[PDB]
Paper text:
The FeS protein external domain (FeS-ED) is mobile between the b (close to heme bL) and c (close to heme c1) positions. In R. capsulatus, both the diffusible cyt c2 and the membrane-anchored cyt cy carry electrons from CIII2 to CIV in respiration.
Focused classification and processing of the subclass containing ~62,000 particles with the highest initial resolution and best discernable features yielded a tripartite CIII2CIV map (SC-1A, EMD-22228) at 6.1 Å resolution (“Methods”), while another dataset produced a map (SC-1B, EMD-22230) at 7.2 Å resolution. The two extreme locations of CIV with respect to CIII2 were displaced from each other by a translation of ~3 Å and a rotation of ~37° (SC-1A in red and SC-1B in blue). This CIII2CIV interface flexibility is attributed to the limited interaction between the CcoP (N-ter transmembrane helix (TMH)) of CIV and the cyt b (TMH7) of CIII2 (top view). In the interface regions of SC-1A and SC-1B maps, additional weaker features that are not readily attributable to CIII2 and CIV structures were observed. However, no membrane-external feature that might correspond to cyt domain of cy, which is an integral part of the cyt c1-CcoP-cy subunit, could be discerned in these maps.
Residue numbers in the entry:
A (entry chain o): 9 to 178, 215 to 234
B (entry chain n): 57 to 527
C (entry chain p): 13 to 52, 60 to 160, 174 to 271, 281 to 295
Amino acid sequence: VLEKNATLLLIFAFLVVTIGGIVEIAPLFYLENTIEKVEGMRPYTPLELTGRDIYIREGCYVCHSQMIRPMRDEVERYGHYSLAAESMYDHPFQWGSKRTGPDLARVGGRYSDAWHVEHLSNPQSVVPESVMPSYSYLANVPLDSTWIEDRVSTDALVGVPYSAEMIAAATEMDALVAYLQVLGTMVDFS
Amino acid sequence: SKDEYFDGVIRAGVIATTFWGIVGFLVAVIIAFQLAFPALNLEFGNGMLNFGRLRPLHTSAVIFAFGGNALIASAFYVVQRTSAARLFGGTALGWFVFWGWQLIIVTAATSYLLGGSQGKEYAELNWHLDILVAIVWVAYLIAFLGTIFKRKEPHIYVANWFYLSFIVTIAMLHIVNNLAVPVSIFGTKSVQLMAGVQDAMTQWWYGHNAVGFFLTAGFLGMMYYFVPKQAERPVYSYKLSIVHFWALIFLYIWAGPHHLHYTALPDWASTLGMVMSVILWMPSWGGMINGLMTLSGAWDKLRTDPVIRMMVVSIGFYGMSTFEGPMMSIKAVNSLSHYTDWTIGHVHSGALGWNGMITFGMLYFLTPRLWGRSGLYSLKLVSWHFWLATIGIVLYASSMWVSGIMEGLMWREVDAQGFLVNGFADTVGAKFPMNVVRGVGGVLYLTGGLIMAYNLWATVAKQPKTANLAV
Amino acid sequence: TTGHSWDGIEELNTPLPRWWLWTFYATIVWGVAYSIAMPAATPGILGSSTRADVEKDIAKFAEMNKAVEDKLVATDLTAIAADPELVTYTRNAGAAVFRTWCAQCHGAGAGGNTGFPSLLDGDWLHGGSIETIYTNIKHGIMPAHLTDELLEPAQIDDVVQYVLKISGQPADEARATAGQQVFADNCVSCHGEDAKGMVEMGAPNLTDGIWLYGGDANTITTTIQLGRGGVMPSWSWAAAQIRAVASYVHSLGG
Ligand code: HEC
Ligand code: HEC
Ligand code: HEC
Ligand code: HEC
Ligand code: HEC
Ligand SMILES: [Cu+2]
C-alpha cells in the first residue's frame, strides 16, 4: 500500500528521485578526464575574467554556444571539437544550448580586436544581416576592478589556480574583447 | 471549526497566475520580435530592451511566475478538496508563500534586466534570491505536506503523489544546482560551485528535472484533479497511475544527459541519459492515456465544454512533446536538433500546448468556485481563447520545426567537394520567416491570454464576500 | 470502480493497456541492448565505440576528397586559379571556403567595407601576385604622427590635405604647402613620393581612386593622427584550404 502512510510515501519519493543524481553527478567529481585542465591552460587573466562576467551579464550565452561537437562539419566550421579539459576553470560553464549566433568556443584569434569592437558596437554595421543586438554601452563603461581580487580569490577557493601574485596584480568593451580572444586558445597552443 | 476551505491564497495565486501569464508571454512575444527585427533592441544604451537580458526574464517569469503561481493555486485548491481539510499553513504559512513568491518574481523582474544572472538556465537568479526561494519553498512544502498529514480520508489521491513529488524534488534540485560562493551582493555575484563538464551535468540534471517535476509532475497533479472533475462519472486506470507515477518519478532524474549529447560530457553519461530518456517515453504516455481514457464516452462534452477542450488538447500536446523528447534524446537525432530552433519548438510545444493549456483549463474551472461563483463570466470567451491558444501553439511549433530542421541541415550540409555548403549567416537568413511566424503565433496565444484576463476580470467583479458557503 | 472518492473523483481499476505495456518493456529491452552495445560491444569499432567516430568521419572524408585537394596542391596557385576543373572548382569552393571563413570581414561579395580590403578589385596593399596573396592568407598581416613632435595638430591637417591632392584635388592652400613638405619628409618613406605605395610594407598607394577607405579629409586626419594598425589573421592554424582560397582570391580579379 503505502498509500495511507505520508512518511513512507515521502521517504520512498526522496529515495526514488535520488538515484539518478547520485549515479550521474557524483562519479564526475571523481573522474579525472573532466577534472583535468589542458596542460598548457592557465586561469583567465583578470581582464578576461572580468570580461567573462560581462559576457554572462549581457546574456551572450543565450545566442552563442561554447561547445564544439565531434562532427566533421562542425569541426570544419568551428575548429577542434571542445574538450572537457578546456572548461575545467569555468564557473559557471558557458557551454551553449542554442546557436542563434555561431559557436564562440574557438575564437582563439579568428578575428581582430578591432573587428570585435566594431561588431559589438553594432553587429549590423559589420554584418548587415545580423540578428545580434547592439552593445555600444560596453564602450561607455569603465572597469574599477575593485571586485576582481575578490572574484579571483573566490575562484581559487573553488580550485582555480590563481596565484596570490595574480590577485594582487589584477572599458567593458576591452574586457569583453579580451575574453573573446582567449576562447579555445588554450587547446590550440598547447 | 475552520471547517471551511481556505480559499484565500488560492484566489490570490489564481489572479496572479493570470497576471504573470500576461507579463511572461508578452515578454515572449517581444523577444521573439527582437529576433525578427533587432531594432526592438536598444541600439545605443543597454536600457530596457536587450535580448540577452530579457530572455531569462521571459524564462523565469513564464516558468516560475506563471507556471509557479499556477502550481500554487492548483495545489492549494486541489489538495484541500482531494483530502477534504482546510490548508495546514493557513493564511499564515500559505499566504507567506504567496507574498514570498511574489517577492521572488518581483526580484527577478528587477534583477535580470539589471544584468545579475548566474547564466545557468532556469537557475539564473542570484544567490540572495536563491536563499529566499529556498525559504519560501520550504514553507510551501510544510503547508502542502501538512495538509496531507491532516487529511480526512485514509488514501491519498495520486494527484497529490505528483504534487508531493514535484515539491520535494524541486527543492532538492534547487538547493544542489544553486550551490555557489558569493563574491558580491548580487546579480550573479556568485560563482558556481562546479565547473566544466561537472557543472554542465549538475545544470542539466537540474534543468531537465525542472521541466520534469515543475512542468510535468506538478502539472500531472493538476491534470489528475481537473480532468476528472466533470459531470460524467468514472473511466480511469488506477494501476496505470501507480506504474506511470513511480516509473516517471524514478526514470526522469536520469534524463539529464540528453541535453549534453556529443559534448565534453563523458560518453557513458550521455548514453545513460539517452537510454533512460527513451524508457521515459512509456510512463510519460501513461499520464496522457490515463487522462484521455478518462474522457471516453464523455467526448460529446468536448463540443459543449471548452474548459474540457483545453484540458484534452493539453494532453494531446503533452503526449506529442513527451514523444518528441525521447526521440531528440537519441544521439543521432540530437546531432541535428541540438542548438537549433527545434529545441525551442519542443519547448513551446510542451510549454504552450501542455503546461499553459492545462493550467488555463484548471483556472477556468477553479476561479469561479474560489470566487464564490457558479461559473466563468462568458463561456464563449473560453472557446475563443481555446482557439486562439491552439492556433498560436501550432503555428509556433510548425515554424520552429521548419527553422530547426533547416538550421541543422544547413549547418551540417557538405558539398561534392567536401566543403561546407552554407555560411552560418545563410542559415540565419533562412530562419527569418520562421522568426516572424513564431512571433505571430506567440502573439495570438498572448491575445488569448488577454481574453482570459478580460473574462476573469469580469467574473471577479461580481461578488465581494465570495466564501462560497461551506466550501 | 474503487470504493474511495476524493471529492467527486473516483477511479476505475483497469488494466494497463497491452500496447502500453509492450512499448514500456520494449524501451527497457532497447535500453539494455543499447548499453551492451555501447560503453559499459558493437562491432565495427575496435576497442570500444566513442565519440571516436569523429576520426572515422574525418578519415572517410579524407579518403573521399583527399585526392581533389592533393591534386590541387601540386599545382601552382596561378594554375589553380585558371583551370576551371581545379581552378573553376577552386573558385566556386574556394569561393565556398571563402564564404564560410572570409566573408565576415571581406564581405560576401569580397568587395570589403570600411576597415577591410576589397579583394575583388585590382588594388593590392601587400601585392597582387599569387605568392603575395597566398602569404597574406597563410601567415596573416602606420605610425601615429599626431604625437611625433613636429607633426602635431597642424602638421596632421596639412599632410591630410596634401594626400587628398595626391589622390585628387580639393582646395586648401595652407593644408597643401605644409603637407607636401611633411610627406616628403616622413610619409614618403613608406608610401613613396607621389604615393605609389610599397607592397613590401603593406603601405597602400596614396594615389588612388575612390575606394571604400575613408577618403574624407577628416578620416585621413584620423589615420595620420593615430595611425593604422589593421590585421589579417593567419589561416595557417585555422585552415590545402589556404591554397584553394588563394586561388579563388586571385581568380577574383580577372
Ligand atoms: C577579419 C579578422 C579578417 C579576416 C576574418 C579575413 N581578413 Fe583578410 N584582411 C583583413 C584586413 C583588415 C586586411 C588589411 C590588412 C592591412 O594591410 O591593413 C586584410 C587583407 C587581406 C589580404 C591582402 C589584400 C591585399 O591588399 O594584399 C588578403 C589576400 C586577405 N585579407 C585574404 C583573406 C582571406 C582569403 C580570408 C579568409 C580565409 C581573410 N582574408 C579573412 C581582415 C580579415
Ligand atoms: C541573440 C540575438 C545574440 C546575442 C544575445 C548575441 N549575439 Fe553574437 N551573434 C548573433 C548572431 C545572429 C551572429 C551572426 C551574425 C554576426 O556575425 O553578427 C552573432 C555573431 C557573433 C560573433 C561572431 C562569431 C563568428 O562569426 O565567429 C561574436 C564574436 C559574437 N556574436 C559575440 C557576442 C557577444 C560578446 C555577445 C554578448 C554581448 C553576443 N554575441 C550576443 C546573435 C547574438
Ligand atoms: C611606415 C611603415 C609608414 C609611414 C612612415 C607612413 N605610413 Fe601610412 N600606412 C602604412 C601602412 C602599412 C598602411 C596600411 C595600414 C592598414 O592597412 O592598416 C598605411 C596606411 C595609411 C593610410 C590609409 C590608407 C587607407 O585609408 O586604407 C593613410 C591615409 C596613410 N597611411 C597616410 C600616411 C601619411 C600622411 C604619412 C606621413 C605622415 C604616412 N602614412 C606615413 C605605412 C606607413
Ligand atoms: C514554460 C512556459 C512558456 C510559455 C508559456 C512561453 N514560453 Fe517562451 N520560452 C520558454 C522556455 C523554457 C524558453 C527557453 C528555451 C531554451 O532555453 O531552449 C523560452 C524561450 C523563448 C524564446 C527564445 C527563442 C530562442 O531561439 O532563443 C522566445 C522567442 C520565446 N520563448 C517566445 C515565446 C512566445 C512568443 C510565447 C507566447 C505565448 C512564449 N514564449 C510562451 C517557456 C515558455
Ligand atoms: C515544458 C514542457 C516539456 C516537456 C513536456 C518535455 N520537455 Fe524536453 N525540453 C523542454 C525545455 C524547456 C527544453 C530546453 C532546455 C534547454 O534550454 O536546453 C527541452 C529540450 C529537450 C531536449 C533537447 C536538449 C538539447 O539541447 O538538445 C531533449 C532531448 C528533451 N527536451 C527531452 C525530453 C524528454 C525525454 C521528455 C519527456 C519524456 C521531454 N523532453 C518533455 C521542456 C519540456
Ligand atoms: Cu531534458
